[PDB]
Amino acid sequence: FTKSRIPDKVFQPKPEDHEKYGGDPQNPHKLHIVTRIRSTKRRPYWEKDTIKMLGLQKAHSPQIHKNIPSVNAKLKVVKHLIRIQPLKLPQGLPTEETMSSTCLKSTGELVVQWHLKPVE
């Protein structure tokens, strides 16, 4: 049992894949939302290390990571233990005023105005 190298074809999407997941092959998203959803117990030690490097020690708690190849390379190692979701900014990036009023939704949207009131 040794580390495996996945064929490059796995990470080359198909036209229907873009339709299903609703992601444009151009203007790719910038930030990942990564959550660990399985345990590192009974997994090889290299998988254990990458999980600690990425900060996913606690399960079901989301961490933000750069959508850059070096980060992606580690994520591919632990692809089976995590869920990757594209961070969305419906109302734009938070500013100094809106830093204290943010909330990350389950949908993947970081809203900058969080009122806890009926939409009305």
């Binding site: 930030l31 750069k66 943010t102």
Partner: protein, 93 residues
């Protein structure tokens, strides 16, 4: 129960996640004076603020790295189109 349905409606899977039921204050004085903030809410806000600042920092660093990359590539271009001295020719140069 109901976790999958809640996610479709945009809510948290567990009713104890982000929503009015948990985050809204549980009480206030009879006079109407607001109560001191709950310790759970203060902690939850601090984590959320920390998460936002990471979002700003990572985006800025990546964007700069993109802009800074362009500038470097330009220099290589101009550096290539460099000429100097003179170009004599013939039986004497």
């Amino acid at each position: 129960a109901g976790g999958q349905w809640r996610l479709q409606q945009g809510l948290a899977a567990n009713p104890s996640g982000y929503g009015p039921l948990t985050e809204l204050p549980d009480w206030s004085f009879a006079d109407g004076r607001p109560a001191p903030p709950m310790k759970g809410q203060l902690r939850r806000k601090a984590q959320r603020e920390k998460l936002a600042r990471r979002v700003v920092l990572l985006t800025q660093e990546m964007d700069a790295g993109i802009q800074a990359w362009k500038l470097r590539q330009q220099k290589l271009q101009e550096e290539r189109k460099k000429e100097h001295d003179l170009k004599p020719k013939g039986t004497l140069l």
